[PDB]
Symmetry: D3
Subunit: 308 residues, 6 copies
Amino acid sequence: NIKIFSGSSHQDLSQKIADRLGLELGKVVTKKFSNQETCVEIGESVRGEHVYIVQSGCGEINDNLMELLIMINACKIASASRVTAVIPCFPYARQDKKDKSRAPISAKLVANMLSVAGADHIITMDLHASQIQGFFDIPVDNLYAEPAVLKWIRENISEWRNCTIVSPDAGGAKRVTSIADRLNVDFALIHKEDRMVLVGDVKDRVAILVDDMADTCGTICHAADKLLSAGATRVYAILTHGIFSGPAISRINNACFEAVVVTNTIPQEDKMKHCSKIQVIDISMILAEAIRRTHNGESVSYLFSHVP
Amino acid sequence: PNIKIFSGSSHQDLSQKIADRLGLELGKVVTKKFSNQETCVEIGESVRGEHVYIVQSGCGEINDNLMELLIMINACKIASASRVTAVIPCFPYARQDKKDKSRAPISAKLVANMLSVAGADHIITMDLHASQIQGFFDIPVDNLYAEPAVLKWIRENISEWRNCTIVSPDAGGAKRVTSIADRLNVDFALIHKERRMVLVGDVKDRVAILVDDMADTCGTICHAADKLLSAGATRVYAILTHGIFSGPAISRINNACFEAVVVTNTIPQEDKMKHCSKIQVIDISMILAEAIRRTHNGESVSYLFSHV
Amino acid sequence: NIKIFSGSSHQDLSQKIADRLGLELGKVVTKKFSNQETCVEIGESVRGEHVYIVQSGCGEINDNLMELLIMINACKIASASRVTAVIPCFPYARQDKKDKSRAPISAKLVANMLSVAGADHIITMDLHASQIQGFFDIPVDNLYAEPAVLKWIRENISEWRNCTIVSPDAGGAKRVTSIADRLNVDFALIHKEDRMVLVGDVKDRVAILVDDMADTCGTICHAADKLLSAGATRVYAILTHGIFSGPAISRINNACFEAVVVTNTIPQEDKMKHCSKIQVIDISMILAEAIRRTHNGESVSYLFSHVP
Amino acid sequence: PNIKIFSGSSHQDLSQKIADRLGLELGKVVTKKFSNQETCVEIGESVRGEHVYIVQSGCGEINDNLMELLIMINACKIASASRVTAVIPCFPYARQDKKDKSRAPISAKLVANMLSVAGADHIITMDLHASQIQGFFDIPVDNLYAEPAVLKWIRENISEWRNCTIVSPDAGGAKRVTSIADRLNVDFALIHKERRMVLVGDVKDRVAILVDDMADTCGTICHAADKLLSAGATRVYAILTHGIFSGPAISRINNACFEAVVVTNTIPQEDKMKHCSKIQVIDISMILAEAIRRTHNGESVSYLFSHV
Amino acid sequence: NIKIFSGSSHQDLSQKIADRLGLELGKVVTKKFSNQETCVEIGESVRGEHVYIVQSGCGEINDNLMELLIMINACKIASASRVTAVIPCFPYARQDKKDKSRAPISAKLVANMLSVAGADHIITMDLHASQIQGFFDIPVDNLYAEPAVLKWIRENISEWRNCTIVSPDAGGAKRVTSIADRLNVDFALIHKEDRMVLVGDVKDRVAILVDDMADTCGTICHAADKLLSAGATRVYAILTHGIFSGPAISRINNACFEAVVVTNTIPQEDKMKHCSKIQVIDISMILAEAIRRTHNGESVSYLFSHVP
Amino acid sequence: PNIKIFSGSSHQDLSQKIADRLGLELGKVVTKKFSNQETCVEIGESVRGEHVYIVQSGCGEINDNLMELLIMINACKIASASRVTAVIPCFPYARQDKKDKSRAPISAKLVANMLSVAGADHIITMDLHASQIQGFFDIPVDNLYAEPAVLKWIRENISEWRNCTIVSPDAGGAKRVTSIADRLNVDFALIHKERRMVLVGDVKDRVAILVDDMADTCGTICHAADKLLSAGATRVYAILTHGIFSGPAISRINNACFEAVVVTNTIPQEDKMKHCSKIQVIDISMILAEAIRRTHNGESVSYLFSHV
Ligand SMILES: [Mg+2]
Ligand SMILES: [Mg+2]
Ligand SMILES: [Mg+2]
Ligand SMILES: [Mg+2]
Ligand SMILES: [Mg+2]
Ligand SMILES: [Mg+2]
């Protein structure tokens, strides 16, 4: 039937997913040389089977990517009937346009590599730009964390009915307006010009900074100040993907957030030990559910407006 | 080396403008439309071994225009043109560039694929609805900007421009307007139709310039104008790079409060201007001419991105 | 299992087909802008399913083609397991060679577009040139109207046993000789040189002009005269595809045909109201049968010599 | 720039004729045949950065010839030739260009695909069995005509040519013969083997010229000749562009009533002519030379289509 | 379900395989012209079916290859759901590198042709270089004769426990060392410098020359002498593929072999009548078993270390 | 015409050496590494219409190096470089070039595919682990040899070289060492780790030169050296073209009996040499420079294969 494999040493999300599906993760024999040259050997037959490979959260993005590509390749030439890549946080997603530079569109290159490696289907969560689906010719299911975020908001913020959803940048409006309209509240936008400007009403309201991902957190931390200076009562930040590299964890601990909420598309345990503002939404059920439905020719649309 | 430039359809205004600036006559193409509007095209001269540029027409009917373009590209390729560049000022189906939570086609990717399979080696276009659309191709795309021309026109036609506001008609236009606002060094603001219009940012007692990449039926831009007046804007202008202007069309602009409505001639505006005094056109033929010339010669087209 | 969708507002043939299969046409949400820019949204899940899309007979060939391409694309990126295009009258089929001109081979371009859009299989009727199957790399089933034509002939023409099958042009010999041999009668050929020449025996025989398609009908009408001048008793014309654009319907009403017979690969109702010489063979059963057999891994060869 | 011309096999007559007209020596290629007639090829000189033309051999054995051609194209491509054109006077498997109501391969499409994947950038050929075969490629194909040469030979060798008939041996040859007949301004007629031969059109007391694109065993052309005499033709000639001439071969032509049998040297005829006085050859090396020269130089090869 | 067809007139191995599977070989209608131009027509429907085509051992390698390619193509455009090529001896396998020459890599070209013809899976035995799997992007199962060879050795050579496995060339070490280690014996290597040198211990031991294929047998015959001159007690040669072209059969009959063992990947009956040193290992069961397992999504790994 | 040469990473030693020999400065590329070591690259100058050579870095981390290379190739392609050649002295994942009886990836094929899809038009490399790897590409690959340089160094540094033995550390290195041994006109021998080391061929009282294409942890080469001494070799040298030298690394070489250990600078050796007196480097920058120069100019790079 279905076989789930995990990208690498991070079984953490893949193990949660396989559990929810009533499955054990398939056997994979890994060997890493010094140059980090990745070795893989699929430890069981996948001949004739529909395979799902869940990319690791091991950290080193180029290592994780190659490993995934290599396992996809190994499964394909081992006669897997189909191979689906489950990539909760899509690598190089922020590199999806030229922006008036002689820049690679590396998210396209990544889509191309996944295709030539032999992927038949992609399942991801909150593509940084939804245009990235168009970077492929194979089907992509781009799951939303929105239902889970709206639920977390209604359950953890007393004042959600009078709050303002804030975008930390110009290109995040659509996302926050969509959330503001669902909750039926206000929205506001920050724009960095080196000075931030705020448009929209946050005074004496709870402010919720919503974004797809936080990396170094320079931006969100500064946005929280700005929001407080403009009269917000308190500030939350909710990111789908919690990268938190560099001084993020330090920037967060010193920042005036009530809480910083992220999904577990990227593993957060280590990060949480050193940062108590962080709360995690488990998205394994959504991913597990999408895999389940996909395999069964069932509908996945359900998951865009609802949490399993 | 030598190049050849052909025009799609019998919109030859842009095409003929372009060929003039380059010191070329438009190539000979013989065009009959059969029965069901089945498109016939025949290249009236040899293109063997030549670098061909086909400038997409402006015959309004988007599927006719697109098929004629594809058929010309094809006819040239199998006639042993050494290279074929499609020049497409207004990229068809550009608005259809994501699923947006629906079982929708990503038609702009279909179009990129069709141009590619038709044999296009290179694409020149202006103000792609989303920059990620370049990523829909594996061939090089040059995405020209009207921005410099617009900035120039704003400074040379709006006296109170130094304290004006640049306004986006919707949430998704944020990035466009903030880039302009930042360059003029003025304020920006955004409108959102709640799913009544809401305006965030200030416009009271200042000229408001609605800026958008394209306007079709103008229902959105014309509402925004009212709200902008309701909000206390002195005068409201509307600036679109692509003036599709159909249906309720020029009706709405007249019965609307725009001081002026500026567009480029990426789409033919001659007829529309007859029934609309408040419409003005920035000629972009020079930019496209210059992009073609430079492209062919190996010089930096990128400079055009910031200058006129 | 199987899902049938119709290209557009013409459900007329697609509805006949779905009926014969015991099915309702799937839900499709269509929106058309002014520029005729086609919008589609598949109104139900097609995930995991074998989809058949039947191209419209809405008239505007480039509109119908793009619409089809767009629905194919939408179904594919919605994870349809397979998508088959049912294209009773193949667009641009008459543009299938260069013919000593710098001409596109647009039927190849059309095959390429259908392929890149994501079609896995084509089902068509009477390709204008059977070489067009070679324009694809995917499987094509090219159904023949011949069995249905031979049946109509045996049942509507008393004198069929002593009739002559006439080709209106040089490149139609094979088709008519094949029909003449099946019926065991004579065949004859018209060739336009601006004068028509007839070779073959039609004197005191019923003459049946057989062709794949009639468009403006200039040719067939003139052939009927010629046949009568050469002594044919009466003349019928039988075309698989009844385009009948331009002055066809006028040319037919003034022409000396006993009857003009066409299939419903193209809708004929409107055309018949204004032309009483026209009779229609329903080919929905054949198409319905091919779809049924294809889906079931059954044999379709049956249909080439026999009417379901 | 410079080009290099290589010959397939040790048929070097056409190849060497061609290279002469171009002032070139044939490139050095080392060729051993192993065991199972496994083909070995080695390019005896650098082709790096060069425009290569490989002229397909005439070693009779069609699969050996085709593999040798593919292997040469490949060897040149991976040796960094900048461009490779296959010159194939007689396109192999051209008769296998449709299914014709059978579970048959479309082998001419297979061949086009194999040439393409072998790395051919361009094809030059003469009298494709069907013009649609150009459509089997995505690369440019130039399909040269023997027609002008044939027309010239007919006028210069048949005294009663002004009142002669051009006759097709079968139904599918109609278009070929009517094009010739129309240019000579004479009569045409067609033969059909009923599925006994039937002749339509007149030939009594006039010279009849059987014209075909190719003759293999000559069973069809030789029967047609009898019937043509039975019908009262004065003298019968046979004119084929491709003289495959195998098996019953030249036997049949001798014991047949042909005044003459004309062919081109797209296939080597030297040996065949030994055992056949009535055979004559139009040399086509000049046309191919001229097509190559012009191709390389960017001039109009199309003129060759009508002239010699 | 599954359908087996045979490449050509050699049903000999294909018939053995179909028997072992409980199947009759599918019907194929073949016609060969003089030029050996191959004609095929699949004599039954393959629509929706998983097809296996077993390449012939008819002798003429280019004929066999084209025939296979043509049947693959015919099956694909006849809507076979899948087509697997069973190619016991992979053609042009010895042409898999440039080797400091301007040589084709013809095994890659062969892989490319098989791919464009429409093969979804390859099943072969003992690729001359296992890198050849990488020449494809589709799955390849490369079966080993090793288990069958080790079994033949243990059962036919009393002294196998004290024998030496010898490679006839430098590039055969891995193969023989692998066999020597399994049997737990010595290995030795011949290297041609025009003089052969032997490294390794063969004195007073039985010597077993093991290789993937023998063609003209010049090398193996000379190696046997060398081995005897160095003190081997007697010499066997075991090749997976017995080509035995040219003077092989004469070279073998005059050579000092105890026996020459080959599989029936290539038919040996005729060859054996004229050479009594030859013994044949039947590998039909292995191939039959791989087909059986593949179709059933079962594991094939079994067969690499074990004989069915 | 002009070319441009860029370097991967901040290993610029080889790159800068190469550009010197060519009289060029390295192109301007701006490189930041984000968070997860996500690679940012920006071409600091126009490459429009230029022939670009990107020299892969030596930053050790193989997946970082490979992604940076792919991203540069991509950035150049979409910036309208007319041609992009990847220069990759040490081909990553080259050891992963077959399955070897496992459900293993063929990662070197994945890599070839990724380079191809990234847009590489041509590959220049040195000493491919297996020559068949060229077959993994459809684009031209030039595989340079260190052999001439090694042969030169052996003759100029080993006094007793005329009666020395060339030794392979394993069974698969046979062909490499016999080619060298044959050219020096000396003895060869081979080592095999029984699956204890076995040595076949003689080395007693003669200098033994271990030759390999690459050494990683040196466990194999360092054991072989012991056995070589145990066997009675006078002095043992080790010669690898690719000195990866990781982990137990230079430790082992020091505590091993090598007179010297020679490597090329396909990989940076500066740091390694600090902790290893017995290491020496043959500079190969001249070969690569010369291959690039000649490649660009259309001259025979093949001469480099045999000479220095
Ligand atoms: Mg699945
Ligand atoms: Mg150009
Ligand atoms: Mg189906
Ligand atoms: Mg050329
Ligand atoms: Mg199967
Ligand atoms: Mg170059």
